[PDB]
Design a protein around this ligand. Structure first.
Ligand SMILES: Cc1cccc(O)c1
Ligand SMILES: Cc1cccc(O)c1
Ligand SMILES: Cc1cccc(O)c1
Ligand SMILES: Cc1cccc(O)c1
Ligand SMILES: Cc1cccc(O)c1
Ligand SMILES: Cc1cccc(O)c1
Ligand SMILES: Cc1cccc(O)c1
Ligand SMILES: Cc1cccc(O)c1
Ligand SMILES: [Cl-]
Ligand SMILES: [Cl-]
Ligand SMILES: [Zn+2]
Ligand SMILES: [Zn+2]
Lengths: 53, 53, 53, 53, 53, 53
């Protein structure tokens, strides 16, 4: 299956909208961690914000 | 018109695909170079990879 | 106008995300309205939350 | 739960194209009948139009 | 203003929508023809179904 | 299940990007093949490049 890669693609658009001019880092380090958590169960806007810069 | 925000929305999706495992950082102060270049001309995928982590 | 058509396709997705469970209507009166407000210059997340139900 | 969220995001972009200047409702009541029918099986464009306002 | 490269990505999505397993027959003249006409005036789904195969 | 129709919309977006102004070609067979291969495991951009014209 290709579930997480398909989930990744929507989660960066959500971090571009949530994060704004603060931006975000989607790097191998703490980006496999937003996938472990937000592609397993639905993350709210405030849980998404904790990955912002 | 929100020309920057609509071009920036496509650019984050193109970067998720081209950077793959390298990932990237999208700071609105690091996102100025890649919007100024790639929203006024079509960037190759090699050009996009120059912004990967 | 096609640039308003395309902006509105991105606006439908951001309201889906911001409005969570609540949802939103995209009747041709709220549409005209969010289009004029938020495709002419950017909208913050508060502003978009105001169109949600 | 993330799978139906993923699906709903792509159905909102389909309803925006199919309904045109009609528009559509996508509140929690309105759009849960849609997801039951169109996220378990594939809906055509003629079935999606039933949900236009 | 319409950036034609960002408009084309939306149009390729729409034809996937419209044509689905019918596909299309690719020729440079039809490709440039669709992006010229539907990136300057809005095309409806019934205009886009003409390009399906 | 709608999962392969959803994967297929994301491949279309990644062939548009990768192929650029060369565009891509459709046949019944290759459309069956890239979904059975790229919706089962992650295809690179250098594998997708084989369907561009
Ligand atoms: C907004 C969003 C996208 C993908 C997964 C999530 O949990 C939430
Ligand atoms: C949106 C986008 C993708 C790829 C190249 C570009 O210049 C712009
Ligand atoms: C498309 C869009 C997204 C978010 C804010 C805007 O003003 C316009
Ligand atoms: C077009 C579309 C998107 C998502 C679910 C569907 O049944 C159909
Ligand atoms: C653009 C596209 C891709 C695959 C099938 C289609 O009908 C249309
Ligand atoms: C469906 C769609 C996308 C892009 C431009 C158009 O005129 C129509
Ligand atoms: C049908 C089609 C049109 C334009 C670009 C593409 O990559 C494919
Ligand atoms: C880029 C991409 C999209 C969808 C499936 C894949 O295997 C690879
Ligand atoms: Cl998806
Ligand atoms: Cl756009
Ligand atoms: Zn998706
Ligand atoms: Zn766009």
């Amino acid at each position: 299956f290709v579930n997480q890669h398909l989930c990744g693609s929507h989660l960066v658009e959500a971090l571009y909208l949530v994060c704004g001019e603060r931006g975000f880092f989607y790097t191998d380090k703490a980006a496999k961690g937003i996938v472990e958590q937000c592609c397993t169960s639905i993350c709210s806007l405030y849980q998404l914000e904790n990955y912002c810069n």
